[PDB]
């Protein structure tokens, strides 16, 4: 079963509910952070690797040798939470918290978060087979069921619809930079200069060249460092890179399903910007 | 700097005082329990890989999707006492505390306890290349002080010698086994062997054959499962398993510092049985 807190999901191994409440009450944010805000299976690791190549100039030694999760800490995990209450700044995490359960500190605080969102039909698929051979979570019992869950949001970290519309309150604030998982893969120089443009980095052309190269779907999960998950899995079952791709969705929705989705989508999106949706296709 | 508590020096991420006084008058000791005790650098993570392996049957399946720092929590630290106190029988841990630091419940328990102790030579060099660029904790400016704190005891977890006299008096008890890096490594097989014997285990021979081989420093060095810790380190170099061998110590000693450290150690160790001196020496 899941723990929850707050009326949301999470893992029952590797979270505490004294934490969470220490993460959102307690946990003190500084104008130095950097944090990368996500709804599950949005992007989250690949973010963090380009934030933590970005740092290297395109050097992959440091990424090759050091854990993803060491590297940009899951703030609201145990790990992550002992680690960070620690770490020197400049601080660099990552968090599915929903608005309402991310650190109060935060909102009086200059620290610079992006927001990666992702077409919901590809994150429900994306979750879908990362979550079925995972342990510490309910798993549902098939592809209908957790497509009925994902629509209600009874799953890790509830509503994506929810936890959308918490958030872009937030997006015309100086150090909210809003992206999508779609302009990431149709054009990831120009986006990576957005975000160089948005923490104020500037790269020489080979430097961008090899943030490029050891980004890519391929190289990383080629990095048992980057292609790590402290998340545990059944091993006796059964990939966080699994495709890398966008609109994997048409291949498992049936028209139905994607009809009754458009129609839930439409339904909850009714009072958010229309180019918000367009930049999700 | 060290968080300081009850005299010896700790990290500062990762654990609190609050929690160590727990460890010491709260915490509960199983009888089933089954628990590593070592002064950081003398092969903690070895033996443990070893007593996952034993565990599994030289299976590598599991070690290889677990963290051994889940496998084998560290007791003291916060991520370890936490999960401990909810994991279910039988458990599996290590410590570093010295003896008067350690839980109090274990004392009157039936609980098993392997100490593994290692040249502090070779300790001295193996700690000061892996806390060298190590995080949360003081940095020595050189190696020459390094091997000034070391010899001093001021150091991570205290004095090498007050630790090995706090738990030497344990030595005779019948849950008490002591163990040398040194002979682990002359004669794995062997060392196992008595492992067995003192945790009432049986083994098929092509359970040690893999226990052995994935419990070598080579296998060992690849699984990223076993071949880290959650110590964050200020990246510079600095790998949980740098050369796994006795007598690196000879590679970076002077041979000033080498006769001061052996007239050192001839004094704080001349109470001891000459016994435990020479299952220090390669
Ligand atoms: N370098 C990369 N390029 C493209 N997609 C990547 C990627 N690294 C990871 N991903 C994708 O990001 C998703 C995981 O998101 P998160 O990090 O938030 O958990 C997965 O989507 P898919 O399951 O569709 O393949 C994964 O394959
Ligand atoms: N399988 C193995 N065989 C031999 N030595 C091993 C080993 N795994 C780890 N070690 C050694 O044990 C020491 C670390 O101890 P601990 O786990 O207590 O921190 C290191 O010593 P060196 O730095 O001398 O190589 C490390 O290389």
Redesign the interface.
């Known amino acids: 079963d899941f723990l929850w807190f707050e009326g949301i999901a999470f893992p029952t191994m590797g979270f ?1 509910s004294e934490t969470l409440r220490k993460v959102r009450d307690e946990f003190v944010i500084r104008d130095e952070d950097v944090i990368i805000l996500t709804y599950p299976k949005s992007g989250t690791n690949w973010l963090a690797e380009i934030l933590c190549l970005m740092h290297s100039k395109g050097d992959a030694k ?1 990424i090759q ?3 993803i999760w ?1 590297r940009s800490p899951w703030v609201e995990s ?2 992550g939470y ?2 960070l ?4 700044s400049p601080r660099l995490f990552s968090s599915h918290l929903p608005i309402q359960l991310f650190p109060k500190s935060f909102f009086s605080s200059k620290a610079k978060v992006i927001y990666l969102m992702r077409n919901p039909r590809d994150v429900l698929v994306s979750g879908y087979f990362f979550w079925k051979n995972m342990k510490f979570i309910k798993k549902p019992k098939s592809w209908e069921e957790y497509f009925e869950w994902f629509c209600q949001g009874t799953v890790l970290y509830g509503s994506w619809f929810d936890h959308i519309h918490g958030w872009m309150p937030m997006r015309e604030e100086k150090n909210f930079l809003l992206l999508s998982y779609e302009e990431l893969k149709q054009d990831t120089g120009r986006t990576i200069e957005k975000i160089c443009q948005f923490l104020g980095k500037t790269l020489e052309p080979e430097e961008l060249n090899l943030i490029l190269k050891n980004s890519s779907f391929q190289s990383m999960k080629e990095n ?2 980057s292609n ?1 998950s ?1 998340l ?2 059944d ?2 079952v059964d990939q966080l890179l699994r495709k890398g791709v966008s609109g994997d969705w048409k291949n498992h929705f049936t028209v139905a399903q994607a009809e009754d989705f458009d129609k839930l989508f439409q339904e909850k999106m009714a009072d958010l910007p229309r180019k918000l949706a367009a930049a999700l296709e």
């Open positions: 505490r440091w040798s050091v854990p060491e145990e790990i002992t680690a209450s620690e770490t020197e048992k460092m790590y402290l545990s899995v091993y006796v």
